[PDB]
Amino acid sequence: TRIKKISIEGNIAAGKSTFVNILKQLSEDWEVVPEPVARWSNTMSQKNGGNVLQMMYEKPERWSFTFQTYACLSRIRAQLASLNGKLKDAEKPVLFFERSVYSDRYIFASNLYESECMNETEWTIYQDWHDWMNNQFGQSLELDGIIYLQATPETCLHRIYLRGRNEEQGIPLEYLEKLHYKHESWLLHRTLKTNFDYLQEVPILTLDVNEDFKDKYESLVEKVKEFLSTL
Amino acid sequence: IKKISIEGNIAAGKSTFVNILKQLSEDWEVVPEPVARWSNVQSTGGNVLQMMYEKPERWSFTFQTYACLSRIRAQLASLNGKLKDAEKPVLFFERSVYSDRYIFASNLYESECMNETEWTIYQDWHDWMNNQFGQSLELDGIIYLQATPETCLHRIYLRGRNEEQGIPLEYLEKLHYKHESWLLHRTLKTNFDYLQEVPILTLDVNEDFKDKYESLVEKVKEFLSTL
Ligand SMILES: Cc1ccc(NC(=O)c2ccc(CN3CCN(C)CC3)cc2)cc1Nc1nc(-c2cccnc2)cs1
Ligand SMILES: O=c1ccn([C@@H]2O[C@H](COP(=O)(O)OP(=O)(O)O)[C@@H](O)[C@H]2O)c(=O)[nH]1
Ligand SMILES: O=c1ccn([C@@H]2O[C@H](COP(=O)(O)OP(=O)(O)O)[C@@H](O)[C@H]2O)c(=O)[nH]1
Ligand SMILES: Nc1ccn([C@H]2C[C@H](O)[C@@H](COP(=O)(O)O)O2)c(=O)n1
């Protein structure tokens, strides 16, 4: 489509929602599509969404498959509906997504299967499912570049505390670390091999969101806007 | 590309009758229930059908979802078959997506195996699946293979499928009633509005037709002439 698609990636509490908001406000033809999993951190889809997430917190090993499949469905469904937004009849349309279909499977669900929360028959079903739902759409959802909000696992643990979600207070530094490394291996080093080929040659901008960018954000916004010309 | 559904209870006589019809003529093909794709989970062991009967309080959601998505997959694949290339093409589906929700998943939710969250997620999913990908799988006529839950319980034993040799009558009963309330009594209301005016051909399959299937083909040939 005419509408370009950019993915906003990063660790838990790295600064994705703060950045996507700073971008929503800007007077450009940009539409932001939030993470359904973030919308459950607080409708006929939230009712479910909140309950799986609350169940995901309580018993991880039981809900990891139920949750990861409803995350990717509520993401796929959303992102497709965003493409039909006003932007179509807009000049320079850019659609930014809080995370992506690739971040779900490769970074989080994978880590969840590795964490012995999804069994082997559970993982096979998720992988065969994901593979199929992505293949059954096309260039519709294909990313035209990714933005990696790089932050040390320690800034994420202090921002987890900042955010104040009491369910997330328990999250340990090791978990963030384990996530951080899975990000760097895909986005930075690019040693992580996804099923979807096209990702191999996709531009990636890496914004060091370590020091609070909440109010000092003109610097990123420019390095973003230039990144946008190169696509 | 006339799409017919073959509906009925566990071991009522769906494949038997389906495979009698398939042999009968060209331009007639069958889209079986992938109850072996569930039996050996791979990427198109792991017997998601056994784990389900083992502990449904833990596997019913995981199952009905994979059962439904594997169907949508093979049913859609069959429409892109060689049937399109012949006169009078009538494709026969062993059960449907309406069967996977209004009978089996619905019963499991009613039997406490799926908590409300699981059930709501299943409906949310099955609704969006059928709206998007299954916009072409809309049935042209349903054949109901009506058999007592007692007969099914005897055929289940004849079959000797171990995954299900531990099925109580209660279960077969609960399903027999749901198929009656949907296909005979016509009172199981669905999210898919057209279903309301889809012809049904209810055939009693209690008295064995393995070699006495003459009458049933004579009725179905007539049924497919109204369609
Ligand atoms: C919300 C949530 C809350 C708690 C947990 N649980 C854990 O991180 C976790 C807790 C305990 C363990 C330890 N297990 C204990 C039991 N044992 C069987 C195995 C090991 C392993 C993992 C997972 C999550 N799941 C998450 N999903 C996401 C996510 C975001 C975006 C898209 N998809 C998923 C982020 S965090
Ligand atoms: O530069 C930053 C980025 C984020 N935050 C805060 O840190 C928390 C986590 O950030 P965010 O909501 O963006 O989480 P994410 O979407 O990355 O998971 C929130 O309370 C933000 O307001 C902040 O104070 N400064
Ligand atoms: O007229 C019939 C139809 C079936 N069967 C037996 O019933 C079992 C289950 O048959 P089928 O798989 O066709 O039923 P479905 O479960 O597909 O409804 C098998 O062991 C068949 O030999 C039978 O004895 N007589
Ligand atoms: N949506 C569905 C469809 C089928 N089955 C299971 C019940 C039986 O164990 C088996 C019946 O297979 P068939 O009638 O094709 O032999 O499939 C199920 O639990 N849920």
Author numbering:
A (entry chain A): 19 to 60, 72 to 260
B (entry chain B): 21 to 64, 78 to 260
What does the paper say about this structure?
In the present work, we identified deoxycytidine kinase (dCK) as the target responsible for the sensitisation of various cancer cell lines to gemcitabine, using reverse-proteomics. dCK is a key enzyme in the nucleoside salvage pathway and recycles bases and nucleosides originating from the degradation of RNA and DNA to achieve the biosynthesis of deoxyribonucleotides, which are required for DNA replication and repair.
Additionally, for each ligand-bound structure, a supplementary electron density was present at the top of the cavity, likely corresponding to a second molecule of compound interacting weakly with the first one in a similar binding mode as the ‘F-series’ inhibitors reported previously. Moreover, it should be noted that masitinib and imatinib were able to open dCK in situ, since we were able to obtain these 3D structures in the ‘open’ conformation by soaking the protein kinase inhibitors in a ‘closed’ dCK crystal. The binding of these compounds also released the monophosphorylated substrate (2′-deoxycytidine-5′-monophosphate), observed in the ‘closed’ dCK crystal and still present in the other nucleoside binding site subunit, elucidating at the same time its mechanism of action. Furthermore, our structural data revealed that binding of masitinib or imatinib promotes and maintains an open conformation of dCK, critical for the release of products and the subsequent nucleoside binding.
